[PDB]
């Protein structure tokens, strides 16, 4: 009783996130600063000799809008679940980020191979993702160059099966900074921040980043123990992590 | 009672921001974002062809979340009353990259303006500390184009123009921060603006995100303003697309 009725408070809090992700011209500029720049890091970039060059991107909330599950979560007060997320990518809804279609054709289609390395499953949620990529008109979206999860969340392995292919990864796309190598995962936000400061230049360059609000790494970074908490947990390490001025606050008749 | 009702719905208004608002001030994600706008903008810069740089100040080179982390906690909606009370209390923060940004422009070949809808009258003297304190270079009377009678921005912009600049960048996190063209439109009109308008982002317009607040908030509805915290509740709620769970 009192942990649904907390579940539903967890879900609320990313209601102006979404708003701002959905309806926003500012979140389609921030797509396209995106893309725009990933365009032309890439046209700079070359293979080391003798490899190919490749471009590696995540996809759920990178080059696919899963917006609608966020808002599901919103209006049922429901959290994640592995259960009802492969139900939602069998509904086969996803959309296309702005920019992230053109983007991925233009690399295929000008020396250059895109691989798709994604945390959903690929053991049950591969058919609705093939589906949904070949309805946005995605190019080049096979049993090579489509890497999705096995038994592990981070990404080092997927992308170091990419480079012994034969490629040269010149660039890296993603909502997550675990999209661009195990350096962050499972660390503390503070510690991604680190990461951030002392990597400051590479983004925009050769680490591309989509805005999301609503999910990530960010959000097991708040603690190390935050998923192992209930939903109040959750909302006191939430509470927790805003730093909030002190007001300015002596009247009387 | 209508006081407790409405309390209690600013209250419930305030903690739907909370999840970006924790995202911006905590994830390494925002930084990057930050960063990977100043990285565009200094290429940009250096690439074009008096040159000036324009740029807005709230939540894009200067960090005011305090402000909003004091109304999730107090449950208050914004006021210019309280605003100014911020701003008074000269606690902004930089936000990642821009002071180095700007003060490369400055030492660079280009000149910075700052064109910012902080009030002149009474938010001048706050933001000129602040802006001091953070090692920003070349604010003066000159570059520092604070707000008088109007929110949109396309009178201090010419105002640059006629000064004899050519201005060959603009920053900001509000779409209006690159001319009238957006100003006082719905966010589907902006989302147009945007799409015609795609190559331009990252070249001569650059964003830095703020989920927080802006003109994306009126533009959810007309009367956005017009009603009470419910009706806001409502059009909020009405704005939200969802999976119908089958």
Do not use: C
């Amino acid at each position: 009783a009192v942990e649904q009725a907390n579940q539903a408070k967890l879900q609320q809090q990313v209601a102006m996130g979404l708003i701002w992700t959905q309806q926003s011209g500012e979140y389609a500029a921030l797509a396209h600063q995106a893309f725009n720049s990933a365009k032309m890091a890439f046209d700079h970039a070359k293979a080391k000799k003798g490899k190919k060059k490749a471009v590696v991107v995540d996809l759920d909330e990178t080059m696919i809008d899963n917006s609608a599950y966020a808002g599901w979560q919103v209006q049922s007060g429901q959290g994640f679940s592995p259960k009802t997320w492969t139900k939602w990518v069998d509904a086969r809804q996803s959309a296309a980020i702005p920019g992230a279609v053109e983007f991925s054709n233009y690399v295929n289609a000008n020396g250059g191979t895109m691989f798709f390395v994604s945390n959903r499953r690929d053991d049950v949620e591969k058919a609705g993702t093939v589906d949904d990529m070949k309805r946005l008109g995605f190019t080049g979206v096979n049993d090579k160059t489509l890497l999705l999860k096995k038994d592990k969340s981070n990404k080092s392995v997927r992308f170091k099966q990419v480079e012994d292919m034969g490629y040269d990864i010149v660039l890296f796309v993603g909502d997550n900074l675990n999209d661009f190598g195990d350096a962050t995962y499972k660390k503390s936000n503070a510690e991604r921040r680190d990461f951030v400061a002392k990597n400051s230049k590479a983004f925009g360059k050769k680490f591309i980043v989509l805005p999301n609000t609503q999910y990530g790494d960010w959000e097991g970074g708040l603690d190390k123990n935050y998923f192992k908490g209930d939903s109040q947990s959750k909302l006191d390490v939430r509470a927790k992590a805003i730093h909030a001025w002190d007001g300015k606050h002596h009247h009387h008749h």
